[PDB]
Design a protein around this ligand. Structure first.
Ligand SMILES: [Ca+2]
Ligand SMILES: [Ca+2]
Ligand SMILES: [Cl-]
Ligand SMILES: [Cl-]
Length: 289
């Protein structure tokens, strides 16, 4: 059964945010333990082209088979679906890297979304991976956040529909029901809320077993999240699931990793700042125990 990591890496554009330690965190992630010994790895918010390609190099040796970053352009992909626009500044932020060859790779930009908050190519990335003769499927995505700017309740509704976009793709792609379909990423639905049950339905997946930390976005123990929202509530937002109509792994587990790198710092205007996290999200590992 596969071993995967999923990680929202907070690699914002160095043009709009020149001092968030983008390049250095790309090196720190490359050197972390959690990033090692997995089959597949999903990234989100690898927005800054330069820092994203560095992070991809840093893992090219253990994970040679890679997809481009969602929404950057139309080349390098077997197909391109949904509302792909080539005018938009920021791209999708999603990419996948695999220890085993990628037989097919497809990008899809969500058709459901918000008109004002942000011109983005958010969506999902599909990959068909060959392992031990057998075929295995992995989708990485990053849905509408609560940091909305859109109406009250609209983000939840947007997500609902963005997820329906994924399951329908799975459905009509017609994948051998004896082949496992992993769907993971920053899903932006908090655990233990009524929306959580909706997510299971809309994505078409069963819940999994949990290990390690009880949140993935934590202003209470994560130095970066603490700076952005010092009074924000800890939430569990990153998940890796499987399609409930395809092969189930033995006993799928999500482990929230809280590994911290050696502290890194930076100078902004007159001030000096220290941090010791890879991102404002914690990475999650997934495996069949
Ligand atoms: Ca974020
Ligand atoms: Ca987010
Ligand atoms: Cl900045
Ligand atoms: Cl800062």
């Amino acid at each position: 059964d596969l071993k995967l990591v999923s990680h929202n890496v907070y690699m914002l554009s160095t043009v709009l945010y020149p001092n968030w330690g983008q390049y250095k965190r790309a090196d720190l992630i490359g050197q972390s333990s959690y990033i090692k010994n997995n089959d597949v790895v999903i990234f989100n918010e690898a927005f800054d082209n330069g820092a994203s390609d560095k992070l991809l190099s840093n893992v090219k040796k253990e994970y040679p088979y890679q997809t481009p970053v969602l929404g950057r352009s139309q080349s390098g992909w077997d197909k391109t679906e949904g509302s792909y626009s080539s005018t938009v500044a920021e791209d999708g932020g999603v990419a996948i890297v695999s220890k085993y060859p990628i037989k097919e790779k497809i990008q899809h930009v969500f058709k459901s979304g918000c008109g004002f908050d942000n011109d983005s190519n958010k969506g999902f990335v599909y990959t068909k991976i060959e392992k031990n003769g057998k075929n295995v499927h992995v989708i990485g995505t990053h849905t509408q956040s609560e940091d909305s700017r859109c109406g009250a309740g609209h983000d939840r509704k947007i997500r609902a529909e963005q997820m329906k976009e994924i399951s329908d793709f799975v459905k009509k792609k017609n994948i051998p029901k004896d082949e496992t379909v992993y769907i993971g990423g920053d899903l932006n639905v908090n655990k233990g809320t009524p929306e959580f049950k909706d997510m299971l339905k809309n994505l078409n997946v069963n819940d999994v077993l949990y290990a390690g930390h009880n949140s993935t976005w934590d202003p209470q123990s994560n130095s970066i999240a603490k700076y952005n929202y010092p009074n924000g509530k800890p939430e569990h937002l990153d998940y890796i699931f499987t399609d409930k109509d395809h092969k189930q792994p033995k006993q799928l587990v999500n482990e929230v990793v809280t590994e911290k790198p050696k502290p890194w710092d930076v100078y902004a205007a007159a001030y000096y700042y220290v941090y010791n996290d890879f991102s404002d999200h914690y990475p999650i590992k997934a495996y069949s125990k």
